[PDB]
Design a protein around this ligand. Structure first.
Ligand code: 6JG
Ligand code: 6JG
Ligand code: 6JG
Ligand code: 6JG
Ligand code: 6JG
Ligand code: ZN
Ligand code: ZN
Ligand code: ZN
Ligand code: ZN
Ligand code: ZN
Lengths: 363, 363, 363, 363, 363
């Protein structure tokens, strides 16, 4: 009887950085149809479909006949988890960001390509908006990446502080998507905290999203455990010593907890937790930024401002090829040519001027 | 020894969107009897029975002899879950609603057909009642579907507010059945909340049914955690960032939480949770609507007002073929001809007039 | 069909003291590429890669074709756990430290070698800083190792007491890395404590890191259960009787709980818990040590002061070959020659003088 | 393919009373090396190594090639648990103590033998110290063994009451090691108590170590649930009726809970819990006993006073061969000859005199 | 390869009413030794050993070579549980007591036989003591058995009320051993109660041992939840309706909860819980009964008063052969002849007279 290559399914999971057994089962099954009569092949909607369709077609047909599909996908997903463990100990944090970048560029190459649906001019309007959020933004993003890559103890966490609709969440999300990693909710009590901090295992960075303090009901701020919990998580935030992180059906992982961001409202920060942050960026709602967005509907509809591709487009536009690792230089040059065709320094400056007047960014 | 095609059982589960292992085992076993001497074949009661009976008959006989029935059905149900994961990432939300629509029309074609038991005139009396519940109802339902399909962050949740027996529950249920998805109970404390929000995994939409607030015992309103919890679930309701949803024996899923509805009584909405809703629809008990229903017993007995087929019948009656995706145009035309035979604009208007006088809708 | 040697995978896990199934899967898979065309082979970055690449290459290719990779690695990791159990009962605590030392020297030989990236002069600047932290430091570290190796009941725990940024954490971490073992958090309540103390199973030593007391909010010290819990854990700290330690999916282990350190701020120690510690070392922030470090950035960036290799480099520099077990004498002599080439007693004394003036240690 | 004898691995586990799967895996693997070139064979350090090395050598080599090591050891450990169940119902409590004695004598024969490291004169100095702790000590130990062996309901528990460093813990530990069994912590609340009392399953005796009462903070005594819990555990302490004891992944065992000791500080004992103890021994710190020990460092360093071998050495020295079961008479005579060579009634009396003056026991 | 008869191991478990997998493994393994050279065969200590040794000897040797012993014993123990389920629904409660009786008589035949160790005259002294505890005792025990066998709703529970050392526990234990069944602890809160009441599954009777009430600290009575809980367990105690009982890894069993006894101190019984008991027996400490026992040491030492064999010996002595089911008449006659040889109505009456004077029962 015909036998499926577990090695080939693993290769596909490795190529797509697949961490989901059900999505792998689903993705691998869609390869069983003939590429000459396939709808998703000729339409070129997924890169993980037409490029791999030929390589996995025969194996996918065999797979469609397996009595043991879930096990095949479990070992593939486990090999992907096994790759990340080796990487976290033998890969330099620079090579870790190049990987993330190459991943974001594949998704970029797809959607802006002659078989994609996204509009590049709209993403560049996102870059305009983002570049208006803070002064020296392209340098603020570059200083963040240096900080996260270098991972220097006690100089690893940035604090984003401000009211709702100030840009703190959007930028933290954008950077989280830029570097790769997870967002964490430390508002739960110390008891259930342990399984939450375990989500941090093998992550390149974390965002402690919307951390809450107490005695701020008078400022219309809700109470939560987040601020006090963060004072107790000194070892995690400082990253001088390794910590024992827990998650279900697994021996508790030991590692230096990841660096990243903490976001919160205008709560008073305890003296001890304040010294844990190397930098603090204060965000305030600017009327021109909100009206601009209200006029540039596509930015919300397409989730452009929360996109890591948007911050990558920003770096490609503002920074020369030398500011990127040698491993993606040819990919940077290609994106630089493409962006040049769509926008210029004069038109970009006009987009920023349109943000400043709170008018639709694109005329 | 004779071997069962796991691939054929999976095909049947895929055809029927089967998420239940026990119902799949049961359904597949009933196919083992001869279609020439079968009772359920000639009676034509289930579409998932006579249309598939021929295709699965021999395999069902083999299946009846298997020592491993539950495993066969586990992989079939897993492949269905795997399809939804791929769909949630590679299918447009428009194609997701066309699927739901095609599903509802199969159930419609069955029950109103020459082997069904439901009375079409009674469903059209349901449409009358529903079309009386709010002005421009056919447009209110159409604006909801646009909102849910487009899934624009911060403009994704509608609030249905009113006392008991006002129509808010009925309509939320009707729309929930129209789009497909799950209802959620956030009245439990933050601790047990996490497994509840996980029910939202791969769902096209959610309904936070009967959300309770505090300090309303004086208005004869019971206390619950629902309102405060919803303020803390800002990330979920806004859908700008992806969230980590949990459920049993599964790695915590990351996705933009689904859009939908929140239903509640006349509790004061905190300023912060009020801005999370794009639209708020106020429902008030109308005496003519309750008496009408008291006179039109069939509507409760057959659960017509909570039916998504009822809202689909409404759209088919009020909207031209062009307001529907091209993929169901032939199916719309057929239903339009069928409805024409049973009702007219003059008789429909009379049904609405009968609702307005609180008389039985059908004379 | 080709069969993988489970015995060879176990041998590799045993060689590398591997306790992680996912890292073992990952490490063993990277051996499948040709050593003549391999990138990690010629670069000589991991010792667990090029030295074992030849021995495990063919088996790794077979392993890449296995339908049962996780099970193979489970038995390998279990055999490593089984080795530690036999060792904890049949190995002298002196042989246990020689093993830890040989492990640290392999990592040392790697990073300072002609294919490593670490700078030896920078580690020796770490030794300078550490040797300034307390008087007779080389003797304080040697008295700690005697204490931990001899494991005399009631004379097994040292207390490191002082404010934040005093050196207590750094040194406890450094010694914990020197001896091998785990850090424990006893700040959680007595209920969840049991699974925490189980982390101590087969450990050569433990560090109860940052133990908190009550009624110290007035000294800007946060409350925690740690101090009271430690009074109740008399049996564990005294080590006269064996204790029943618990962890998931395992029969509760019975053994004399490990010795080690307790770190805490300037909380009042209850009379009963004070007598449990043979020695108490008071740490105070010295301005010259902090400025020195602020000037010697490499120490934080490379985590030199928390390194057990740093304390081993210290012992190799200060102590003659006779102060080490006979089993590592040839390894001590080699490191002594290497250190001599880079630094002298005159230049070391200058480094200490630079610490004392709070200037960058290396000129 | 070569097949491992599961029966031979079980025989080894049975011989060594092995209750640990990981230690069995480890122990059985060390037998695979050639006994003619083995280091642990010629050194004669473990009796479970050289005596069994020949018998298990070939099977251990086969075992080293097994793909199913953990299962083999699970059945071996289960057979050992199965032996204890049969023994607890078909073995007389006298035969149960002879087994414990034979076990202690094997460990004794090993360490004092021409390939052991322990010094017999030092253990006899331990006997001196212990024989000074209470008058008629050799008779106090003998009355305890009668009490535990006979297991007469309501006359089964002895209470050891006194301050810290009084000898109560040491003696309870010594007797617990003499009889075999487990120590229990009943200071946890009634909720978590059930899994703690389950540790008592098949145990020959138990020690409720350091039981705490309330309203004693004024005497510098910490509060705990232990005293009240013990009043509620009337059925367990009385042993007239069988009790349902619980532990993980097992059907709740029914048996007469084991007899033993309760240790506690100078807390007031409730009238009802006082009648549950047949005997109460009051321990007070004697300055001469503490100074003696401070002068006889070897006693702590080697854990001689907590050793059951120490109490066995005591009985062998004080009691004639007739006071022991006929099954160990030849073993008693041999130890009597050996002890005679090292010590005399005159020199023993001098050791006791040295304890009484608080001087080092050995001159 | 030689195959073990799972059917034969099941037959042995069925014969011995074995509910323990570990004891079955142990018992079945001891049959592998030659019966001609076996020690336990010729000594005739266990009936489950020499009578079955011949029948299971060859299978036990095969079993000693099995790689799957625990599974074999799991199916045997499951078949025993399966027998009890069929019995509980198809066996009359009279046949259920005959089974219990035949079981007790096998243990009786063994211990009093020419290869047993128990003294019959001592058990008859137990009968004397028990027959003194309450007037018309032989009739009080017979009325209890009628009550439990007939199992008439609302007339199923007897209340044993009195202080400690009054006889209530002893008699409840004696009757519990007479009928077969389990003792339950309802002093835990309603939350953990559900798994406790599940112990009642397939049980012929239950004893709610030492039920505690509140507001009795003034009478030197400890507080517990037991009394209030019992008011809430109306359905269980009344046995008119079936109840859903829960236990681990099993679908919640539905049945009429078993009848039995409730024991408690002199707490006030709430009016509602008082009507749930058909009979209430008041026990008071009698000085003559305690002194008698103090003089008849063998009764405690051998646990004669808590023995169901003791109550069976009582019925055999007091009641004619006709008061027993026809199925055990030959067994009753044999015991009647045996008892006649050891004791007479005149000597029994003297034993009762010795109890009444508080003197040792046997002269
Ligand atoms: C109907 C409705 O809810 N409308 C709505 C539309 C846009 C809104 O803004 C945002 C939404 C998402 C992400 C970022 C922002 C902003 N960032 C900044 C940054 C700085 N100064 C202002 C803003 S707003 C808020 C609400
Ligand atoms: C005996 C009994 O319980 N009778 C009963 C019968 C009908 C009732 O109404 C409803 C029941 C289900 C769904 C919707 C409604 C209503 N929707 C509106 C909408 C607007 N103004 C009024 C209503 S009623 C209530 C109670
Ligand atoms: C921006 C920022 O956070 N800077 C920073 C830089 C260095 C700091 O110090 C330390 C950091 C890690 C480990 C040890 C120390 C010290 N040990 C002693 C020991 C004795 N007297 C002083 C010290 S400091 C603190 C903070
Ligand atoms: C530095 C340090 O902690 N020293 C130390 C050294 C010895 C100590 O004693 C003991 C230690 C273990 C076991 C027993 C004892 C005693 N038993 C009795 C029995 C009767 N009267 C006195 C004692 S002491 C206490 C402390
Ligand atoms: C040293 C010690 O603890 N001695 C001891 C010895 C015997 C004791 O009694 C009993 C023990 C077990 C079972 C029953 C009884 C009694 N039943 C009745 C029944 C009626 N009036 C009196 C009694 S006593 C109590 C304590
Ligand atoms: Zn394709
Ligand atoms: Zn049919
Ligand atoms: Zn290599
Ligand atoms: Zn050997
Ligand atoms: Zn026998």
């Amino acid at each position: 009887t015909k036998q499926v290559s577990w090695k080939l399914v693993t290769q596909y999971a490795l190529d797509t950085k697949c961490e989901d057994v059900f999505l792998l089962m689903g993705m691998y099954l869609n390869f069983q149809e003939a590429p000459a009569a396939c709808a998703a092949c000729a339409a070129a909607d997924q890169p993980n479909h037409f490029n791999h369709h030929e390589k996995h077609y025969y194996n996918a047909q065999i797979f469609a006949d397996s009595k043991n599909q879930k096990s095949i996908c479990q070992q593939a997903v486990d090999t992907v988890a096994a790759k990340q463990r080796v990487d976290s100990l033998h890969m330099t944090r620079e090579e870790m960001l190049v990987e993330r970048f190459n991943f974001l560029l594949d998704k970029m190459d797809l959607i802006f390509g002659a078989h994609g649906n996204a509009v590049l001019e709209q993403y560049m309007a996102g870059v305009a908006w983002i570049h208006c959020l803070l002064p020296q933004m392209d340098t603020v993003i570059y200083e963040f990446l240096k900080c996260i890559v270098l991972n220097i103890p006690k100089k690893r966490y940035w604090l984003f502080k401000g009211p709702i609709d100030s840009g703190k969440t959007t930028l933290a999300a954008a950077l989280l998507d830029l570097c790769g990693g997870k967002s964490l909710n430390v508002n739960m009590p110390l008891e259930r905290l342990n399984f939450e901090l375990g989500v941090g295992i093998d992550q390149f960075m974390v965002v402690f999203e919307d951390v809450k303090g107490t005695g701020a009901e008078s400022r219309d701020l809700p109470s939560g455990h987040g601020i006090s919990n963060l004072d107790c998580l000194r070892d995690y935030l400082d990253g001088s010593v390794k910590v024992n992180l827990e998650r279900k059906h697994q021996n508790k992982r030991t590692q230096v907890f990841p660096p990243g961001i903490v976001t919160m409202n205008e709560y008073s920060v305890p003296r001890t937790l304040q010294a844990r942050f190397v930098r603090q960026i204060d965000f305030r709602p600017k009327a021109y930024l909100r009206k601009s967005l209200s006029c540039s509907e596509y930015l919300l509809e397409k989730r452009i401002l929360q996109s890591g591709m948007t911050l990558l487009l920003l770096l490609i536009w503002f920074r020369p090829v030398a500011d990127f690792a040698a491993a993606i230089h040819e990919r940077i040059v290609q994106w630089k040519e493409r962006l040049d065709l769509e926008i210029s320094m004069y038109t970009f400056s006009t987009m920023k001027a349109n943000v400043g007047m709170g008018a639709p960014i694109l005329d």
